[PDB]
Amino acid sequence: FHSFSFYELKNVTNNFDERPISVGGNKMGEGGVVYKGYVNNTTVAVKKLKQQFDQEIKVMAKCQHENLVELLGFSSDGDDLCLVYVYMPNGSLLDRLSCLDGTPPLSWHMRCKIAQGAANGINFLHENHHIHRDIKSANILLDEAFTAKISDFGLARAMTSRIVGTTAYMAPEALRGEITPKSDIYSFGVVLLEIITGLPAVDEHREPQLLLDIKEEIEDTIEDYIDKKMNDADSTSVEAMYSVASQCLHEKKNKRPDIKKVQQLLQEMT
Ligand SMILES: CC(C)Oc1cc2c(O[C@@H]3CCCNC3)ccnc2cc1C(N)=O
């Protein structure tokens, strides 16, 4: 990891121009704020935010995998804390599912590669005894070849008083304070429902507001929910991915499959 001085990161991000890229600024998104930078011949991602910063570096130093984002460097010039990453041209899975900024809809073929890639990333994390604690489509980034790269390891862990994560993706025991890798499985089940439907996990102007509630709705079909912005989706593979998501979303943590089974099932699907 390269140690950058804050001034270097100031200059490459147009003094952290917080305006969105579309408006002429450098902001890519927020969780801290993510800025586009240009360091020499390289386009980079600069996250300007301490325990979460030290944890992000700690996890990245140990975890290097093609389905995890790569940390290039950092900056800790007192007050301001920055994390520098390899640039992901196709942004997040959330934005590609919503076709934000007019990007074309992802094909079913591509969606299957993304789901498999994301499962391989979680498997590496779990094999290396790490619980992500914030698995969501906004944290699944896409490179130039649409290779799934898991991001945001600031809250990662090797019961708690401080409950953290994204409510719409969280398992019941996670909402209660339990720290378990079985909780990441549940959240991935929500991500698989987003991949199938193209619907966000939460929508205030929707019935049901929460995507995970459609599983109970179907248990009373998935064909009605399949993303219509695809022409290469076959019922056999869609139902097979839904079966994986359904198993992931079992409300009883011990009845959910481990990431290795999830990988195996996603492999058997294609
Ligand atoms: C590792 C991380 C800093 O990298 C990125 C984050 C991105 C993003 O972040 C949102 C806020 C943080 C939570 N995720 C959503 C949205 C859209 N595109 C993003 C591209 C990158 C990248 N490295 O090119």
DSSP 150: E
Tokens of 143: 């490179």
Cα–Cα distance, 257 to 179 (Å, whole number): 17
Residue nearest atom 8 in ligand 1 by C-alpha distance: 29
Q: Is 140 helix (H, G, I), strand (E, B) or coil?
A: strand
* 33 DSSP β-pair partners: 30, 48
CA-to-CA separations, 209 to 87, 203, 214, 242, in angstroms, rounded: 33, 5, 10, 19
Domain with CATH 1.10.510.10 in the chain: 88-270
Cα–Cα distance, 114 to 189 (Å, whole number): 14
Q: Compute how many other C-beta atoms are within 10 angstroms of the C-beta atom of residue 161.
A: 5
Cα–Cα distance, 247 to 168 (Å, whole number): 17
Identify the CA nearest to 164 among candidates 182, 186, 179, 181.
179
Q: How many A from CA of 11 to the centre of ligand 1?
A: 20
CA-to-CA separations, 237 to 41, 43, 78, in angstroms, rounded: 42, 37, 51
Q: Please state which of the four CATH numbers 3.40.980.20, 3.60.40.10, 3.40.190.10, 1.10.510.10 is assigned to the domain occupying 88-270.
A: 1.10.510.10
Residue 36 CA, closest ligand 1 atom number: 24
Q: Compute how many other C-beta atoms are within 10 angstroms of the C-beta atom of residue 42.
A: 12
Place of tokens 């953290």: 164
Tokens of 231: 């022409």
Identify the CA nearest to 134 among candidates 72, 59, 242.
59
Cα–Cα distance, 210 to 30 (Å, whole number): 22
Which residues lie below 8 Å from residue 213, measured CB to CB, with a gap of 6+?
none
265: alpha, beta or left? (left if phi > 0; alpha if psi -120 to 50): alpha
The pick from 1, 34, 63 for probing ligand 1's pocket by mutation, whose C-beta has the most ligand atoms within 8 angstroms, reads 34
Q: Within 152-180, where are the H helices? A: 172-175
DSSP 53: H
Find the Cα–Cα–Cα–Cα dihedral 181, 184, 186, 187, rounded to 10°.
170
- The resolution, in angstroms to one decimal, equals 2.5
